[PDB]
Design a protein around this ligand. Structure first.
Ligand SMILES: CS(=O)(=O)Cc1nc2ccccc2[nH]1
Length: 435
């Protein structure tokens, strides 16, 4: 695997031991060969699990999620996918890694897709090797891969709202269930219904995942209600997955706004990763996978692949060259390579809007490419009437940094800034000049 111009897809089935068995073998061999190596974890939770798999090996943990004192001598770096892409974008030296290892390499967040594009381009240029570790490579059509133990697969209607009757099988279960929902708001309603029926429920989403995931170890629970973030190597001691088979798709309409379309079917890869939370224990056959819909290739035209192009157009590779998306996922977007390349000062604004601003890539781009500076929040209030953001059926209002109460009406409307209470709270803080 460790030869220049090699990209290997380590596509062992879920729970086959890619992280705990294969990865330390790869790392020892890379250290022996003096390959400057990066290991990319999708989440801080996975970064911490990797430390345990790699214990004793000379690895530099570029994450506050791991407590180790380093030698200062490590040639193997470990960081999150997002951290890698973030450092590429910033005016900071990122080593030209000889070996690039991406764990949970199916992750479809923009920074992960961009990292795969940058890495696969360096490999194609002859410069580097790469290993993408996932059961579900891009364009996989198999929602029912092999498992450590046999799984009971049943197609069944799954509730997406509070229910009173007709789903006794949901609550009649005495074990632990991981339930994939298409959104935080949908999980909130299902969670409230289960809590009312006497169940102990933990909810996981991107913003809450590190903190809340620890509850699955520290407290007794009957259900975990999770969005798609638990597709990325989250492990549970569960004997059932309930899968809505639904997700939200961010969609750019007319180059001018982002909507959260759906819910609509998941990809085959997502469905296989959802299912792959169970069947992991060869001593516990008969884990259950209950699924409420079919799959479709909903990554086609999904904003994350266009956002990935906005990131890659703004990453230095060599002179004016621009990294391509990883070939198997390159047709998910219709973009002109280089169309999103920004001049130095607009690029700095773009980066700050994503890093400090915590804005979605697409929205950060609209603001930065308009020539607006990071602290100029006038655009949060001068949109068309149909861009008015609503909070509990009334227009959302903030006090501007000038001390004026104004209706939140952004010039560019991206649905992700108000997809749940937490998102809108964060965007209100932004519009007010509070970060
Ligand atoms: C024990 S340490 O030296 O803080 C490990 C480390 N090295 C880093 C380099 C860049 C960013 C974070 C980093 N954390």
């Amino acid at each position: 695997m460790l030869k220049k111009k090699q990209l290997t897809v380590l596509d062992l089935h879920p729970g086959a031991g890619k992280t705990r068995r294969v990865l330390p073998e790869i790392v020892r061999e890379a250290i022996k060969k003096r390959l400057r190596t990066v290991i990319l974890a999708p989440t801080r939770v996975v970064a911490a699990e990797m430390e345990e798999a790699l214990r004793g090996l000379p690895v530099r943990y570029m994450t506050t999620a791991v407590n180790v004192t380093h030698s200062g001598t490590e040639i193997v770096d470990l960081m999150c996918h997002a951290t890698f892409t973030s450092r590429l974008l910033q005016p900071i030296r990122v080593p030209n890694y000889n070996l690039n290892i991406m764990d949970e390499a199916h992750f479809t967040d923009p920074s992960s897709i961009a990292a795969r594009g940058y890495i696969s381009t360096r490999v194609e240029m002859g410069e580097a090797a790469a290993i993408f570790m996932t059961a579900t490579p891009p364009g996989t059509r198999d929602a029912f891969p092999d498992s450590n133990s046999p799984i009971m697969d049943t197609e069944v209607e799954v509730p997406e709202r509070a229910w009173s009757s007709g789903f006794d099988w949901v609550t009649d279960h005495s074990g632990k269930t991981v339930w994939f929902v298409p959104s935080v708001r949908n999980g909130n309603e299902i969670a409230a219904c289960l809590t009312k029926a006497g169940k102990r429920v933990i909810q996981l989403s991107r913003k809450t995942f590190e903190t809340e995931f620890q509850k699955t170890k520290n407290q007794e629970w009957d259900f975990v209600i999770t969005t798609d973030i638990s597709e990325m190597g989250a492990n549970f001691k569960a004997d059932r997955v309930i899968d809505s088979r639904r997700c939200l798709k961010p969609v750019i309409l007319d180059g001018e706004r982002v909507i959260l379309a759906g819910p609509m079917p998941v990809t085959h890869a997502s469905a296989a990763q959802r299912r792959g939370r169970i069947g992991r224990n060869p001593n516990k056959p008969g884990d259950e996978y209950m699924y409420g819909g079919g799959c479709a290739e909903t990554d086609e035209g999904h904003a994350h692949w266009l956002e990935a192009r906005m990131l890659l157009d703004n990453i230095y590779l060599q002179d004016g060259l621009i990294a391509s998306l990883y070939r198997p996922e390159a047709d998910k977007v219709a973009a002109i390579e280089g169309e999103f390349k920004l001049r130095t000062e607009q690029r700095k604004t773009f980066v700050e809007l994503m890093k400090r601003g915590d804005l979605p890539v697409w929205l950060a781009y609209q603001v930065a490419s308009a020539g607006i500076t990071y602290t100029d929040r006038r655009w949060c209030f001068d949109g068309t009437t149909n861009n008015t953001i609503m909070e509990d059926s009334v227009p959302a209002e903030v006090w501007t940094k000038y001390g004026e109460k104004r209706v939140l009406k952004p010039r560019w409307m991206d649905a992700r800034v108000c997809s749940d209470h937490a998102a809108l709270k964060s965007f209100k803080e932004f519009a007010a000049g509070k970060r």
